[PDB]
Amino acid sequence: AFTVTVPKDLYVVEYGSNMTIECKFPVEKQLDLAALIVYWEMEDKNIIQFVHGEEDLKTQHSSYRQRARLLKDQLSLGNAALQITDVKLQDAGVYRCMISYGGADYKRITVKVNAPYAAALHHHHH
């Protein structure tokens, strides 16, 4: 049946770098945007809603506001990759890619985030 697949489920990213986590689903013929739902979340924090044609951000968590860009271009190729700019220590954890396009599945992807000493020191308080 319908199945979202993840090129890798573990990404290890350095502090402050960019990060594109990929998520592929099948595109029958040409992608029907009105029938598509894409939904990126990370440990109960809603990162991105893509519902029947456009992005819902009025539900986006604060900690991700204007850092999480869903590549509206690669949706037409069945790749819902999420791009996060300037990664922080807080961004490490289990991400969930949930897709509903005549069927629905999800996959988990883990991010560990490396940081130099100074970053890990400021995260130890702030």
Summarize as ranges the residues that interact with ligand KWA (CB under 6 A): 37-39, 98-100, 104-106
Q: Is 53 in the site for a second copy (CB under 8 A)?
A: no
CA 14 – CA 122 distance, rounded (Å): 16
Using CB under 8 A as the binding criterion, the count of chain residues that bind a second copy stands at 13
CA 6 to chain centre: 11
CA 114 – CA 102 distance, rounded (Å): 38
In the complex with a second copy, the residue whose CB is nearer, 32 or 86, is 32
Q: Which residue has the tokens 């689903």?
A: 25
Q: Is 10 in the site for a second copy (CB under 8 A)?
A: no
Contacting a second copy (CB under 8 A), which of 77, 102, 112, 116? Answer: 102
